[PDB]
Amino acid sequence: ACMERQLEAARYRSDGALLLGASSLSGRCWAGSLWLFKDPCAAPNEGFCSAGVQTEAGVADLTWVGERGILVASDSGAVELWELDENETLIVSKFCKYEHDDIVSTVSVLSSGTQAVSGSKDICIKVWDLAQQVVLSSYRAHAAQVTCVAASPHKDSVFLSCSEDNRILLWDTRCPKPASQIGCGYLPTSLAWHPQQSEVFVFGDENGTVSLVDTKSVLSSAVHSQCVTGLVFSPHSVPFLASLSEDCSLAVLDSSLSELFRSQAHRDFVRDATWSPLNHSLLTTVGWDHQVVHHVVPT
Amino acid sequence: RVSSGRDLNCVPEIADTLGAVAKQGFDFLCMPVFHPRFKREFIQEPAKNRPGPQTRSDLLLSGRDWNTLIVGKLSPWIRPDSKVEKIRRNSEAAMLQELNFGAYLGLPAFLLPLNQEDNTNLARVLTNHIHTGHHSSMFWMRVPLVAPEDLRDDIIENAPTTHTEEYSGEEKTWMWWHNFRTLCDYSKRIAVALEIGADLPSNHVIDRWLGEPIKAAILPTSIFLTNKKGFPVLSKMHQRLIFRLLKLEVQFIITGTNHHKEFCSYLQYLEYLSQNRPPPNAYELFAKGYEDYLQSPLQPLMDNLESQTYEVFEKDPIKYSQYQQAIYKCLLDRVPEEEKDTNVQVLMVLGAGRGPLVNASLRAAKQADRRIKLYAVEKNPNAVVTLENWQFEEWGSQVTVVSSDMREWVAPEKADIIVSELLGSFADNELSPECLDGAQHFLKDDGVSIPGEYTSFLAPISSSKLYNEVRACREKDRDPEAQFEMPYVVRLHNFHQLSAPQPCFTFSHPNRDPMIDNNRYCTLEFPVEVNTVLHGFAGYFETVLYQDITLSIRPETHSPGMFSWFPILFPIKQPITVREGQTICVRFWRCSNSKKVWYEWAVTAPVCSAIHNPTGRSYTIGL
Ligand SMILES: CSC[C@H]1O[C@@H](n2cnc3c(N)ncnc32)[C@H](O)[C@@H]1O
Ligand SMILES: Cc1cc(N)nc2cccnc12
Ligand SMILES: [Cl-]
Numbered sequence: 001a002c003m004e005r006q007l008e009a010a011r012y013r014s015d016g017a018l019l020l021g022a023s024s025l026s027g028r029c030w031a032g033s034l035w036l037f038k039d040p041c042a043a044p045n046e047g048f049c050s051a052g053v054q055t056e057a058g059v060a061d062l063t064w065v066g067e068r069g070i071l072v073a074s075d076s077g078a079v080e081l082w083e084l085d086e087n088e089t090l091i092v093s094k095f096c097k098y099e100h101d102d103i104v105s106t107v108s109v110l111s112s113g114t115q116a117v118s119g120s121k122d123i124c125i126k127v128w129d130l131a132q133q134v135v136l137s138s139y140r141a142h143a144a145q146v147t148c149v150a151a152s153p154h155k156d157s158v159f160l161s162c163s164e165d166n167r168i169l170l171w172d173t174r175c176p177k178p179a180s181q182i183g184c185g186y187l188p189t190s191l192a193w194h195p196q197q198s199e200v201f202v203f204g205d206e207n208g209t210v211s212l213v214d215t216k217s218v219l220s221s222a223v224h225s226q227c228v229t230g231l232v233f234s235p236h237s238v239p240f241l242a243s244l245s246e247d248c249s250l251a252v253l254d255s256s257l258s259e260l261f262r263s264q265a266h267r268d269f270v271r272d273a274t275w276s277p278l279n280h281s282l283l284t285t286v287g288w289d290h291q292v293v294h295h296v297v298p299t
Numbered sequence: 300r301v302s303s304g305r306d307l308n309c310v311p312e313i314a315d316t317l318g319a320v321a322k323q324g325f326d327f328l329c330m331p332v333f334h335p336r337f338k339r340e341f342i343q344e345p346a347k348n349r350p351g352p353q354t355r356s357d358l359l360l361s362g363r364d365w366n367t368l369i370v371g372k373l374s375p376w377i378r379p380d381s382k383v384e385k386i387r388r389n390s391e392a393a394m395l396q397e398l399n400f401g402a403y404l405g406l407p408a409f410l411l412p413l414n415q416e417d418n419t420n421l422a423r424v425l426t427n428h429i430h431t432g433h434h435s436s437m438f439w440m441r442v443p444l445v446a447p448e449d450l451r452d453d454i455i456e457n458a459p460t461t462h463t464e465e466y467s468g469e470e471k472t473w474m475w476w477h478n479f480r481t482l483c484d485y486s487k488r489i490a491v492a493l494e495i496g497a498d499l500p501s502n503h504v505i506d507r508w509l510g511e512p513i514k515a516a517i518l519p520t521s522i523f524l525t526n527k528k529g530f531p532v533l534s535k536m537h538q539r540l541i542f543r544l545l546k547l548e549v550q551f552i553i554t555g556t557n558h559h560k561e562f563c564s565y566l567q568y569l570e571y572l573s574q575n576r577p578p579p580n581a582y583e584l585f586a587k588g589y590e591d592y593l594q595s596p597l598q599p600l601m602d603n604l605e606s607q608t609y610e611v612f613e614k615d616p617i618k619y620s621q622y623q624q625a626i627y628k629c630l631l632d633r634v635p636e637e638e639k640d641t642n643v644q645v646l647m648v649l650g651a652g653r654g655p656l657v658n659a660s661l662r663a664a665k666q667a668d669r670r671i672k673l674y675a676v677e678k679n680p681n682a683v684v685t686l687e688n689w690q691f692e693e694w695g696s697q698v699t700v701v702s703s704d705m706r707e708w709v710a711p712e713k714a715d716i717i718v719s720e721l722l723g724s725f726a727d728n729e730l731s732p733e734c735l736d737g738a739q740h741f742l743k744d745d746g747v748s749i750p751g752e753y754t755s756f757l758a759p760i761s762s763s764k765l766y767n768e769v770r771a772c773r774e775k776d777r778d779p780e781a782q783f784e785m786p787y788v789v790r791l792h793n794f795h796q797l798s799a800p801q802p803c804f805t806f807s808h809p810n811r812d813p814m815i816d817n818n819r820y821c822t823l824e825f826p827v828e829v830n831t832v833l834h835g836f837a838g839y840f841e842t843v844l845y846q847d848i849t850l851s852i853r854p855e856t857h858s859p860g861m862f863s864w865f866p867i868l869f870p871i872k873q874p875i876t877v878r879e880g881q882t883i884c885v886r887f888w889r890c891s892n893s894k895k896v897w898y899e900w901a902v903t904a905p906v907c908s909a910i911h912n913p914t915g916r917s918y919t920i921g922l
């Protein structure tokens with residue numbers, strides 16, 4: 001019946017239906033859930049949803065895997081693949097593999113779409129094969145909790161990672177030594193690749209700074225007052241950067257990281273943001289106040 | 300049976316989670332008291348005004364379950380030594396909140412990580428929780444043998460793992476702990492939950508934790524090798540460590556997900572290792588209970604020992620067959636076979652107690668085929684009642700009992716042999732030298748004394764545990780550091796011998812000498828090969844009863860199955876850092892006036908201590 005207070009993830013698929021992940025971070029029962037909304041404006045209301053399911057444990061992160069695949073990062077230590085049935089009403093579990101030793105915090109699908117990478121509090125990073133349902137490779141590069149992992153959009157063997165050990169690692173699994181350390185400082189908290197420019201990404205730190213980085217070779221702005229939790233570029237040709245935080249604020253930003261929009265409608269931590277593929281000025285956010293806010297960005 | 304808990308970071312139904320864990324065979328569960336990811340704000344609006352409940356109800360479990368079964372864990376996001384002021388301030392409030400909630404619940408212990416160098420503000424906030432309210436909760440510092448940084452996969456191209464042995468560097472996690480507990484003023488409530496990794500470090504790194512208050516050992520499922528059949532096991536080197544931890548009777552925590560079978564299998568293995576070890580030997584069976592238990596050393600001269608104290612002495616028949624043999628050998632060397640009928644020897648047990656040595660002398664004479672005359676000199680008049688009842692009932696006129704002090708006794712005749720057992724754990728700590736000097740006048744000019752000689756040994760040790768136990772003996776109505784200026788008999792157990800025992804004081808009987816002076820001053824230099832912390836000096840002894848017959852509690856030359864004597868401990872007030880390669884130089888004095896005898900001592904290198912027990916101010920031995 002009821003959807004859990006703390007909304008963690010929110011992502012639009014190609015057609016414009018909205019995926020919502022959530023968990024109970026208090027009360028008697030600490031479990032998670034997955035929810036599809038074919039009317040986005042209807043979220044978060046449980047009665048007016050297309051599909052829904054209960055997971056046994058919480059939901060730290062998730063992502064889409066194509067059009068009907070939902071890859072989930074749980075507290076249990078398992079990476080889960082849920083799929084929709086042939087008419088998109090039920091959400092069935094394909095696999096649930098307990099391979100990390102602590103809360104699986106972050107997850108991201110690689111360019112191919114047949115593999116994905118996960119990061120956990122156990123400090124380990126693992127590359128998954130989604131067909132064979134097994135871990136191909138396991139890397140203990142970091143010296144502290146894996147905060148965020150972000151797949152390279154176009155290069156299937158590349159990805160970023162960041163951690164509480166202060167490292168940002170630019171991966172490339174074609175090397176015998178894949179990880180590579182990147183400088184500019186406070187701990188990295190969020191990661192986002194630039195969609196057009198293959199050589200560029202941005203990172204947000206725990207102090208509320210967002211900074212622009214080229215892989216070869218550095219502008220930066222103090223955007224938020226607290227930790228930058230998530231970073232999602234818009235689907236425009238010249239894309240805007242949406243930045244989240246634990247200050248319960250949202251800012252959309254331009255190329256040079258100057259401030260265009262500001263939203264303080266959120267009363268608790270802003271956990272995810274996701275741009276509508278149909279209407280590029282429309283941006284959707286979620287948070288622990290249970291709000292699903294839809295902003296009109298002045299583009 | 301091994302006490303064993305389960306460590307989880309994901310609890311949906313605390314009811315079901317517990318029951319599952321209890322059905323698996325785990326004594327207890329380590330779990331989060333709040334949500335690991337439920338980060339909270341205590342300053343900035345709107346987040347500070349978040350509608351509760353902030354966590355689960357205490358009503359979900361019974362008081363008994365909270366008190367016995369649940370071990371709280373600090374929320375992983377709580378980082379009070381963060382570089383960011385806001386995170387620091389939030390974490391301080393978050394930490395107190397969590398710890399205060401664990402106190403409210405009555406949890407037996409609460410877990411906290413030591414995963415970086417500077418944990419100064421963590422220590423501060425914890426110290427404050429400890430001086431706020433009145434609660435008995437233990438605190439278990441999760442700290443690894445080897446830091447994750449030092450066991451990371453060598454897979455960063457531009458940040459390679461150095462392939463150079465760094466001796467002190469490999470021990471850094473000990474220093475993380477040392478600085479934390481030093482900052483928190485050596486609280487008895489702050490113990491170690493030592494976390495083990497898949498590859499163990501060098502022995503000196505593990506040995507560093509000897510002496511430390513390890514209340515738990517955490518074993519991640521990932522460290523377990525798989526065998527042919529499919530069960531989890533550990534490498535022969537890990538087992539050695541487990542058997543060492545099993546002696547410390549630590550509680551074994553199992554962390555991480557089931558990579559293997561049951562979970563009982565991980566637990567069942569620990570049981571299998573525990574069942575199959577070398578069993579408790581006859582010394583260690585007697586000593587079970589007294590492990591690192593401090594006792595005042597006995598003074599049977601100044602005090603009158605109890606009937607049971609004498610009974611304890613008598614449960615070591617090995618010791619008395621050694622006394623029997625030494626007397627037996629001596630009789631033959633004095634009385635030649637042709638003289639055996641004519642020549643009756645005068646034996647004098649000096650300090651006879653309830654006459655175990657009296658019987659050993661009667662039996663030695665029977666086995667030697669030589670005739671003897673006995674005298675049983677005992678100062679204690681309560682023990683004399685025991686003798687005189689043995690003496691009326693069995694011994695008869697052969698044994699003469701003498702209720703007197705051996706130093707006072709006007710003897711009717713001189714002795715061929717004076718037998719005695721006036722030796723403490725430090726040999727001369729019961730004042731046998733002074734006693735036998737007074738008895739020396741009634742030895743024949745060619746007389747033997749059994750024992751003929753005794754020597755005390757000393758060795759520097761490291762036990763932050765035993766340091767803490769001595770520290771807890773502060774008493775009303777005396778010097779607040781008196782407890783550090785006095786010896787303790789104790790079965791030393793969780794400790795580290797930092798150097799081989801060297802001899803300290805020696806006495807020979809009879810003391811053929813003009814100006815008999817029993818005071819001493821000995822300087823020892825102990826070569827130390829490890830990085831460590833000196834907290835005191837263990838004391839042992841050795842005695843030559845007669846010729847090759849010996850008694851010894853010196854560990855390397857220990858007399859077989861002799862549980863009666865335990866080692867002695869001379870603590871120091873302030874622990875001393877000792878680097879690998881440095882020399883511990885200790886000084887020991889034996890001192891005396893007409894009325895009392897005592898030890899003074901001092902460490903002079905690598906740094907000077909104060910002179911301990913000057914003028915017997917805190918400790919004396921009554922003449
Ligand atoms: C077996 S413990 C040694 C025994 O020696 C006795 N003892 C110690 N000092 C003297 C002494 N000066 N004279 C006689 N007996 C002594 C004690 O009462 C104790 O029973
Ligand atoms: C057997 C015995 C004799 C003695 N004189 N002192 C002792 C101190 C400790 C244990 N045993 C002792
Ligand atoms: Cl913990």
Ligand SMILES: [Cl-]
Pocket residue numbers: 593594595772
């Ligand atoms: Cl005591």
Ligand SMILES: [Cl-]
Pocket residue numbers: 895914915919
């Ligand atoms: Cl005095």
